[PDB]
Amino acid sequence: TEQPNWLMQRAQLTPERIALIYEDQTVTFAELFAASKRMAEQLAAHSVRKGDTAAILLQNRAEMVYAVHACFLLGVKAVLLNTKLSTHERLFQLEDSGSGFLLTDSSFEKKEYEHIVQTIDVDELMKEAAEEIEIEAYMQMDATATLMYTSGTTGKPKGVQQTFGNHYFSAVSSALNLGITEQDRWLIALPLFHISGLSALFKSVIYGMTVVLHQRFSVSDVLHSINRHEVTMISAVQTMLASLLEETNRCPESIRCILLGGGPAPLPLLEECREKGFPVFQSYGMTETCSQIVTLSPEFSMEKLGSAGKPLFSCEIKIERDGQVCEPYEHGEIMVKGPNVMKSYFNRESANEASFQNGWLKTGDLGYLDNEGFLYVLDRRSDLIISGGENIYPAEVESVLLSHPAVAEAGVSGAEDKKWGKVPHAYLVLHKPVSAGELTDYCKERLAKYKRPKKFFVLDRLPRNASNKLLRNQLKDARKGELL
């Protein structure tokens, strides 16, 4: 039911191995444990207690890694907050999560949250003297470690409860797939508040593996960093891979694995990677599976071009239509099972009842398996738009648009975008005139920037079925004029 705290044990086993490279900082596992314990002590001095919930609002930096591990050492659930969210969106997640604290810095406006949580500046925190404490030396496998918000298919996002067990089994299953060696170093230049970034921190302490952390994604900085630090592994979404290939015709020699996730990739991009020797491992995974659950090796990437691969060891996938398992090549809903699959959504009784069926999690994605068991994900959802690896839920954007007094009806669907894959376009029935710039300013207060419509259209009515349900995939074809 319990394991020794991974950072504590890692520091005991290999104290001088490098845990973290960030800018001009190198942090050993010993140093990482010491800094996380110290930050835990300082958090306890600000009244944080075992069983509490603390939200983290930070850009990628060493202090963010300290904060996550400090929470674990205190027995505190960590809520990772997307830094691009508006105040409005963050407030809901702070309240819904039951957070009592917000750990952030001066680059965010802490005063807007003071009425709901105690705000703590991590940089001021680390300057304070505090009494030493006895850390939580064990992680309970079934305890919720981290909460991440996703799947706002009805308008409001859901908090995914990711257990210590989930994170352990994710890391172990990935190691069994990719192999692990002492020379491996993993470069993370995508947000630590996504499980794409955060999972590398757990791989780091479980494997004893250096993570090279970047705050932002810059292709040239990433190429220099790979060279300087002999990076062997890197995670990416397809926009990042596309940017890498636009910069260089050759993959750095030390790279043995580019873990590609977070949405569909254009097939010409994957073919170019294979042609030019980029070792791309396409994968299928989500917040709810604590990162990858199906992954595709480069050796099959052209024979199975279009496939996400096979389930990781200990994990399972099946395709069902209305409760009937599908034959090979028959389309249906992707359902997943494994020790990396989340406990449940936080305080979403109805969603949990709907989403789980006899141990299996319904993903909401459509796909099929071929005759060898390889998964093919079909880009068919209209309740989800993926832009640069960021999920956008039409229901959330539509809810904001509908709240405007001039808007009578609202539909949002994804338009093709060469750089981002898909971007949201808005389709509106108006009571009164309103400009695109007016609505954009209105969305700016309520939506992260990547969620705001890139184009607006005005219609007399929206396409709906006999039950009055919006048919989002039919919005692009309706009679409309562009709204200026």
Among 215, 218, 243, 314, binds a second copy (CB under 8 A): 314
Picking from 423, 414, 461, 457, the residue whose alpha carbon sits closest to that of residue 439 is: 457
Does 285 bind ligand S0N (CB under 6 A)? Our answer is: yes
Residue number closest to ligand S0N, CB atom: 388
- Give, as ranges, the residues between 409 and 448 that touch ligand S0N (CB under 6 A): 420
Q: Cβ of residue 32: shortest distance to ligand S0N, in angstroms? A: 21
Residue 369 amino acid letter: L
Does 328 bind a second copy (CB under 8 A)? Our answer is: no
Alpha-carbon distance 33 to 293, whole Å? 29
Picked from Ca ion, Na ion, Mg ion, none, the partner binding residue 32 (CB below 5 to 8 A depending on kind) is none
Q: What character string, x for contact with ligand S0N (CB under 6 A) and - otherwise, covers 374-393?
A: -------------xxxx---
Alpha-carbon distance 174 to 184, whole Å? 14
For residues 157-196, one letter each, b for 16 or more C-beta atoms within 10 angstroms of the residue's C-beta and e for the rest, the string is bbbbbbbbbbbbbbbbbbbebbebeeebbbbbbbbbbbbb
Stretch that binds ligand S0N, among 14-22, 36-44, 284-292, 433-441 (CB under 6 A): 284-292
Residues that bind ligand AMP (CB under 6 A): 150-151, 261-264, 282-288, 308, 363, 365, 377, 384, 386, 391
**Cα–chain center distance at 331:** 26
Evaluated on CA atoms 194, 150, 395, 442, the torsion sign reads negative
**Which of residues 69 and 304 has its CB atom nearest to ligand AMP in the complex?**
304
What would the 3-class secondary structure string for 432-445 be? CCCCHHHHHHHHHC
Picked from Mg ion, Ca ion, Na ion, none, the partner binding residue 167 (CB below 5 to 8 A depending on kind) is Ca ion
**Which of residues 15 and 339 has its CB atom nearest to Ca ion in the complex?**
339
Alpha-carbon distance 191 to 60, whole Å? 6
The count of residues interacting with Ca ion (CB under 5 A) is 8
Q: What character string, x for contact with ligand S0N (CB under 6 A) and - otherwise, covers 169-208?
A: ---------------------xx--xxxx-x---------
H or E segment and range at residue 224: helix 219-229
* Residue 396 · residue 453 · CB < 8 Å: no
Query: DSSP characters for 184-218?
Result: -EEEE-S-TTSHHHHHHHHHHHHHT-EEEE-SS--
H or E segment and range at residue 257: strand 257-260
Residues contacting residue 429 through CB under 8 Å, at least 6 positions apart = 407, 408, 409, 410, 458, 459, 460, 461, 462
Picked from Ca ion, ligand S0N, a second copy, none, the partner binding residue 180 (CB below 5 to 8 A depending on kind) is a second copy
**Which of residues 26 and 297 has its CB atom nearest to a second copy in the complex?**
297
Q: SS3 of 381, please?
A: coil
The count of residues interacting with a second copy (CB under 8 A) is 23
Among 290, 319, 386, 401, binds Ca ion (CB under 5 A): 290
Picked from ligand S0N, Ca ion, a second copy, none, the partner binding residue 217 (CB below 5 to 8 A depending on kind) is ligand S0N
Q: What character string, x for contact with a second copy (CB under 8 A) and - otherwise, covers 24-43?
A: --------------------
Picking from 332, 331, 470, 482, the residue whose alpha carbon sits closest to that of residue 413 is: 470
Among 82, 170, 173, 307, binds Ca ion (CB under 5 A): 170
Among 180, 269, 415, 458, binds a second copy (CB under 8 A): 180
Residue 263 amino acid letter: G
Q: Is 51 exposed, middle or buried (0-12, 13-18, 19+ CB in 10 A)?
A: exposed
Query: DSSP characters for 8-35?
Result: HHHHHH-TTSEEEEETTEEEEHHHHHHH
Stretch that binds Ca ion, among 32-40, 120-128, 141-149, 195-203 (CB under 5 A): 195-203
Pairing mode of beta strands 210-213, 185-188 = parallel
Picked from Mg ion, ligand AMP, Ca ion, none, the partner binding residue 143 (CB below 5 to 8 A depending on kind) is Mg ion
Q: Cβ of residue 326: shortest distance to a second copy, in angstroms? A: 17
* Residue 206 · residue 6 · CB < 8 Å: yes
Does 286 bind ligand S0N (CB under 6 A)? Our answer is: yes
Pairing mode of beta strands 280-286, 257-260 = parallel
Q: Cβ of residue 27: shortest distance to Ca ion, in angstroms? A: 20
Q: Give the C-alpha distances (Å, rounded to integers) separating 174 from 123, 168, 211, 268, 275.
A: 34, 10, 16, 26, 25
* Residue 55 · residue 346 · CB < 8 Å: no
Residue number closest to Ca ion, CB atom: 199
Residue 64 amino acid letter: M
Picked from ligand AMP, Ca ion, Na ion, none, the partner binding residue 337 (CB below 5 to 8 A depending on kind) is Ca ion
**Which of residues 263 and 285 has its CB atom nearest to Ca ion in the complex?**
285
**Binding region for ligand S0N (CB under 6 A):** 190-191, 194-197, 199, 216-217, 235-237, 239-240, 259, 261-262, 283, 285-287, 291-292, 387-390, 420, 449-450
**Binding region for Na ion (CB under 5 A):** 27, 31, 50, 59, 74-75, 107, 327-329, 349, 353, 356, 362, 364, 398, 421-422, 470
**Binding region for Ca ion (CB under 5 A):** 167, 170, 199, 290-291, 316, 337-338
**Binding region for a second copy (CB under 8 A):** 3-4, 9-10, 12-13, 172, 175-176, 179-182, 206-208, 310-311, 313-314, 316, 339, 373
